Amino acid sequence: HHVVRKAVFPVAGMGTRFLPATKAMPKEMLPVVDKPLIQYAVEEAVAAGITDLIFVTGRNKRAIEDHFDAAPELETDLEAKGKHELLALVRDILPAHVNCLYIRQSAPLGLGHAVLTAAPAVGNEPFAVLLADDLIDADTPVLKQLIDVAVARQGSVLGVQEVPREDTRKYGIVASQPVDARTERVTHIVEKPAPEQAPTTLAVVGRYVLEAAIFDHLRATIQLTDGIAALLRERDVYAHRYDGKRYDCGSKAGMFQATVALGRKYHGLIPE
Amino acid sequence: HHVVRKAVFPVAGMGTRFLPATKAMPKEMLPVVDKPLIQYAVEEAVAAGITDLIFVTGRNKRAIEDHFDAAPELETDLEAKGKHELLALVRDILPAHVNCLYIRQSAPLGLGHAVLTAAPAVGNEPFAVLLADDLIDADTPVLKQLIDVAVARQGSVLGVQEVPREDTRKYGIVASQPVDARTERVTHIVEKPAPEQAPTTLAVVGRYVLEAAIFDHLRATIQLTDGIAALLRERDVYAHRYDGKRYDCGSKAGMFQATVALGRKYHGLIPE
Numbered sequence: 091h092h093v094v095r096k097a098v099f100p101v102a103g104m105g106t107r108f109l110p111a112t113k114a115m116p117k118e119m120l121p122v123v124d125k126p127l128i129q130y131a132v133e134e135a136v137a138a139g140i141t142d143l144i145f146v147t148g149r150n151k152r153a154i155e156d157h158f159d160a161a162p163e164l165e166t167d168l169e170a171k172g173k174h175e176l177l178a179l180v181r182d183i184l185p186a187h188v189n190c191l192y193i194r195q196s197a198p199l200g201l202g203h204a205v206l207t208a209a210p211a212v213g214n215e216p217f218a219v220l221l222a223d224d225l226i227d228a229d230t231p232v233l234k235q236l237i238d239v240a241v242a243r244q245g246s247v248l249g250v251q252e253v254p255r256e257d258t259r260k261y262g263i264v265a266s267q268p269v270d271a272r273t274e275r276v277t278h279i280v281e282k283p284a285p286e287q288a289p290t291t292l293a294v295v296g297r298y299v300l301e302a303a304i305f306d307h308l309r310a311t312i313q314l315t316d317g318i319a320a321l322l323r324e325r326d327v328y329a330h331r332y333d334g335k336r337y338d339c340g341s342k343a344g345m346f347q348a349t350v351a352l353g354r355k356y357h358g359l360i361p362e
Numbered sequence: 363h364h365v366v367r368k369a370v371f372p373v374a375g376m377g378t379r380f381l382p383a384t385k386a387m388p389k390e391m392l393p394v395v396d397k398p399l400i401q402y403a404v405e406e407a408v409a410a411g412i413t414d415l416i417f418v419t420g421r422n423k424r425a426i427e428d429h430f431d432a433a434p435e436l437e438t439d440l441e442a443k444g445k446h447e448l449l450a451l452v453r454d455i456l457p458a459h460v461n462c463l464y465i466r467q468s469a470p471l472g473l474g475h476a477v478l479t480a481a482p483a484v485g486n487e488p489f490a491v492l493l494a495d496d497l498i499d500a501d502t503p504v505l506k507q508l509i510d511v512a513v514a515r516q517g518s519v520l521g522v523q524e525v526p527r528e529d530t531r532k533y534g535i536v537a538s539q540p541v542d543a544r545t546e547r548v549t550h551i552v553e554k555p556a557p558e559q560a561p562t563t564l565a566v567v568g569r570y571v572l573e574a575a576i577f578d579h580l581r582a583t584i585q586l587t588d589g590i591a592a593l594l595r596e597r598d599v600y601a602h603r604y605d606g607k608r609y610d611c612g613s614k615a616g617m618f619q620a621t622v623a624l625g626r627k628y629h630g631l632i633p634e
């Protein structure tokens with residue numbers, strides 16, 4: 091009985107691909123229009139049934155915690171001016187059945203180290219990992235799509251998307267074999283292959299459902315990719331081509347396209 | 363001998379027109395592409411000859427201070443990975459002839475109270491005021507244009523822009539008389555007039571050069587507009603229609619247009 095109720099948000103990194111905006115502000119707090127990247131990722135997890143949110147964070151990232159906590163002085167200001175609609179955007183941003191906890195990563199030693207850092211809070215359960223700089227706009231939350239596959243197949247699941255072959259140098263690419271239309275069994279993961287040498291055009295994105303067996307593989311490993319490759323030998327790992335549109339907001343170019351696209355879709359904002 | 367060397371940046375406000383992005387992050391830190399609003403405003407002041415930067419700030423706004431201070435852990439990370447170009451975006455963001463100081467505003471009691479809060483650091487000098495949510499893209503820094511007028515005429519100067527008459531309800535509008543092509547003498551300021559009743563279509567923007575005489579008028583006043591109206595009786599106040607394009611980034615709509623426009627101009631980013 092596979093139950094995924096915990097989601098890990100690695101948010102301890104330095105955000106260097108987005109300077110100077112991120113000199114003194116977490117990349118995860120940068121807004122797509124009027125909402126931080128981390129809020130979209132959290133809402134997706136909650137919408138997929140996650141109840142326990144685990145942030146692996148750092149000294150200079152208090153804004154992330156403060157964003158999901160009460161802000162009493164602001165809530166007092168809004169009540170005082172009678173702006174009760176705004177009060178609802180701020181108060182109880184998370185529903186009452188969800189809880190958050192935070193863990194300091196010693197140093198920014200990698201995504202793999204960040205995942206390993208969450209092990210005491212996760213225990214032996216399977217768990218989700220979401221990278222907030224991958225903003226996904228989907229009719230059905232992408233993490234829900236991935237969890238459903240992981241439960242049905244009793245294995246780990248990597249969210250993948252089709253990319254142009256000429257761009258494979260930018261991603262981790264799975265070598266995999268189809269099992270059904272959207273789901274493939276992973277046999278290898280290759281970091282940043284040449285286009286002509288890429289085994290598939292399926293790039294790993296920042297959405298994972300992982301069995302707790304991953305933790306031991308990361309202690310011998312610092313790269314989550316290498317941990318996953320080790321796991322492949324013991325346990326089943328699948329890739330799932332999810333339905334949705336990803337924007338890579340780790341850099342200004344994808345952030346900009348997300349701003350334009352969700353600007354139009356959700357806000358009625360159109361380039362003048 | 364009129365010398366404007368000090369600029370005041372009111373940055374203590376709650377940013378409520380941009381929630382939830384600003385729940386736990388200052389509005390002034392929100393980026394236009396890859397740079398915070400406050401950095402554009404500061405760069406404009408420095409480019410106009412300002413040497414003394416005065417921030418009127420609040421408890422939850424440490425990111426602003428941290429942005430203009432050294433970030434040693436980040437500078438160590440960038441040197442360690444040999445990324446010396448990025449090191450230049452972060453280290454000495456301000457030239458060596460400029461200095462910053464910070465003053466806590468007791469509570470967010472208004473722009474007029476914020477200006478008055480800076481009085482001990484300003485002394486009897488004329489001084490600039492810039493509101494970072496007014497992002498101005500100009501060939502010649504707008505504050506320089508305003509200072510030049512203030513020195514030449516030995517009076518205070520309000521930056522104004524022509525707005526559509528149907529939008530006058532959104533702004534403070536000067537009643538004024540032309541003295542030369544871009545410069546007018548102010549006789550009244552009317553807050554948010556009906557279009558058919560607006561005295562002109564010249565709206566005050568977030569750029570001021572003010573004589574120290576303003577401070578006494580704000581102690582009897584909490585609205586900078588009312589302080590300026592009092593000053594008009596004693597001293598000369600001019601409005602200057604500056605050359606430049608303003609974006610009102612206090613809200614998502616103008617921020618979005620700034621993102622599109624400066625995205626294209628400075629970053630090569632074009633809506634897909």
Ligand SMILES: O=c1ccn([C@@H]2O[C@H](COP(=O)(O)OP(=O)(O)OP(=O)(O)O)[C@@H](O)[C@H]2O)c(=O)[nH]1
Nearest residue numbers: 100101102103104105106107198199200201204
């Ligand atoms: O040591 C680390 C490294 C990375 N991460 C987290 O892994 C995710 C994916 O890592 P990214 O490479 O997308 O983000 P980054 O902040 O490390 O970016 P750069 O400086 O390299 O430009 C991000 O959400 C990051 O916060 C950690 O939590 N800890």
Ligand SMILES: O=c1ccn([C@@H]2O[C@H](COP(=O)(O)OP(=O)(O)OP(=O)(O)O)[C@@H](O)[C@H]2O)c(=O)[nH]1
Nearest residue numbers: 372373374375376377378379470471472473476
């Ligand atoms: O008490 C105050 C009020 C305003 N200000 C500063 O005055 C400038 C113009 O004030 P704005 O109205 O543009 O900003 P705000 O943050 O007050 O916004 P809302 O909550 O009303 O949406 C902003 O730069 C603000 O920081 C202060 O410094 N202190």
Ligand SMILES: [Mg+2]
Nearest residue numbers: 103104200201
């Ligand atoms: Mg990284």
Ligand SMILES: [Mg+2]
Nearest residue numbers: 221223224340
């Ligand atoms: Mg990334």
Ligand SMILES: [Mg+2]
Nearest residue numbers: 375376472473
């Ligand atoms: Mg205000």
Ligand SMILES: [Mg+2]
Nearest residue numbers: 493495496612
């Ligand atoms: Mg404003």
